[PDB]
Amino acid sequence: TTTATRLTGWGRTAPSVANVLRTPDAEMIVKAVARVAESGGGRGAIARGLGRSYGDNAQNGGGLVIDMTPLNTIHSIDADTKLVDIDAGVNLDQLMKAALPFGLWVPVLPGTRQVTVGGAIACDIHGKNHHSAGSFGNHVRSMDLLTADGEIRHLTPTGEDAELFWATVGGNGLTGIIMRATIEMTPTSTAYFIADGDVTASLDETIALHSDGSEARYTYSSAWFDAISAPPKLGRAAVSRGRLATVEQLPAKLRSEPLKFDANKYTFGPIGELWYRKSGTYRGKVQNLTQFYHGFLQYQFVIPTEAVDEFKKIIGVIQASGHYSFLNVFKLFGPRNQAPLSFPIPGWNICVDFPIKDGLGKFVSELDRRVLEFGGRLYTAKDSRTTAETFHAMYPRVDEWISVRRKVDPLRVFASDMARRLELL
Ligand SMILES: Cc1cc2nc3c(=O)[nH]c(=O)nc-3n(C[C@H](O)[C@H](O)[C@H](O)COP(=O)(O)OP(=O)(O)OC[C@H]3O[C@@H](n4cnc5c(N)ncnc54)[C@H](O)[C@@H]3O)c2cc1C
């Protein structure tokens, strides 16, 4: 039934061999968990989605990995209740396509739509709209969770079982296997955005633009960030902010199908600086999703809002480090949710991408130290190399979480490389 496969995260690193069960049959999945649970705990099992996490959370060296992607049935979409009832293996692209004709919008979209609902819940994913909509877990109204004892529990965010619900959110598959879930969607009259763009000249401007109160006028907001240039150019950004369009705001050419989907010699001189300011500055531009969205070590952290000087310092440490990240996504996160292991907290969030090079491993450890000291944290979906000590200090509700985890899996039936590395087992 199960194939001995060699798995990595998206980052393609720290590989381990696991037995991969790949079946559309939910009964064969309940029975595999039943089959891991009688052998004491062994090296346990972990669910896997589309494998878009960069780290080691969806692999289990010498254990069972359950590929959930065949479980990809959309059960119902209701435009009156805004509810979708889907298998955990459906991905967000599939869901977005299916839901559009109902005037329904996926409430949190990450950078790639090739992620499963299970992965979205287990990493409590965030998107361009976090400050206004929170993260993925905020919009789950129920889920069905295959736990260690082979029973399927029906969890809701409030009432009985809320605790296990909120431990599952952001729990990296370590509470069991999400089989099915109900998501509340965001109503929309169009598949379009109305976007405003701005280009800042420095880090100070970027931060200033995100604290001048303008952010409250936008539901969606993110920025491409300069992390290579020396000050004052360091931290200059192309900001893209917006909100879903209404049909009255579409041009006539689009208004009849409102929900349908489908370096020269100047470049680094003053004419290019002008061109790029001009091209990046705009108001009320109508965009579809693709236009509005757009050997390596991926690293993402958030620093709490107040610690602005500390955030500025970390960015300085980054550019003077001799490690050059060209692709950097910046955003200001809004209020957190009640999940103990949820990554997002209100504050300055950035994702960087370092070429793998001599000194890099030791430099990001130092980064960890700084991020930790400044009260922020790393994102498990990007990580495969931080220590359990650092992680546990970054997430002070980890003991709270672990304690919930030991109630629901005393025999450690669910386990992964990440769980063992970060001592979440
Ligand atoms: C190009 C790119 C851009 C990205 N942008 C963003 C972004 O903007 N915001 C953001 O928050 N993230 C982003 N991510 C990270 C990604 O959204 C998460 O890593 C997500 O969890 C991946 O989903 P997956 O289905 O691929 O799950 P996998 O990577 O296969 O697994 C991820 C985790 O979820 C658990 N899991 C999966 N299915 C289940 C299940 N059925 N039951 C229980 N647990 C399960 C796994 O055990 C594992 O712990 C990005 C990733 C990439 C590659």
Of 300, 220, 289, 226, whose CA–CA distance to 259 is shortest?
Answer: 289
What is the C-alpha separation between 294 and 243, in angstroms, rounded? Answer: 16
Is any ligand 1 atom within 6 A of the Cβ of residue 172? yes
What is the Å distance from ligand 1's center to 295 Cα?
20
DSSP character at residue 256: T
What is the pairing mode between strands 186-187 and 152-155?
A: unpaired
Is 44 a known ligand-binding residue?
Answer: no
What is the C-alpha separation between 321 and 67, in angstroms, rounded? Answer: 39
Q: Which amino acid is at 406?
A: R
C-alpha distances (whole Å) from 25 to each of 50, 66, 72, 87, 219 are 18, 12, 11, 12, 39
**∠303-124-106 over CA atoms, to 5°?**
115
Residue 106 and residue 99 in contact, taking contact as beta carbons nearer than 8 Å: yes
Helices assigned H by DSSP within 174-294: 203-209, 270-280, 289-293
Q: Is 66 left (phi over 0), alpha (psi -120 to 50) or beta?
A: beta
Experimental resolution (Å): 2.2
The structure tokens listed for 39 are 């052998």
What is the pairing mode between strands 64-67 and 45-48?
A: parallel
Domain that holds residue 116: 1-425
Residue 300 and residue 345 in contact, taking contact as beta carbons nearer than 8 Å: no
What is the C-alpha separation between 340 and 167, in angstroms, rounded? Answer: 6
Q: Give residue 111's Cα distance to chain centre.
A: 8
C-alpha distances (whole Å) from 185 to each of 80, 107, 136, 143 are 11, 5, 11, 15
Number of domains in the chain: 1
Q: Give residue 243's Cα distance to chain centre.
A: 20
Residue 106 and residue 95 in contact, taking contact as beta carbons nearer than 8 Å: yes
Task: Map tokens 């690293």 to a residue.
Answer: 299
The structure tokens listed for 336 are 């957190």
Q: Which residue out of 52, 94, 293 has the highest number of ligand 1 atoms within 8 Å of its CB and is therefore the one to mutate?
A: 52
What is the C-alpha separation between 46 and 409, in angstroms, rounded? Answer: 13
What is the Å distance from ligand 1's center to 115 Cα?
6
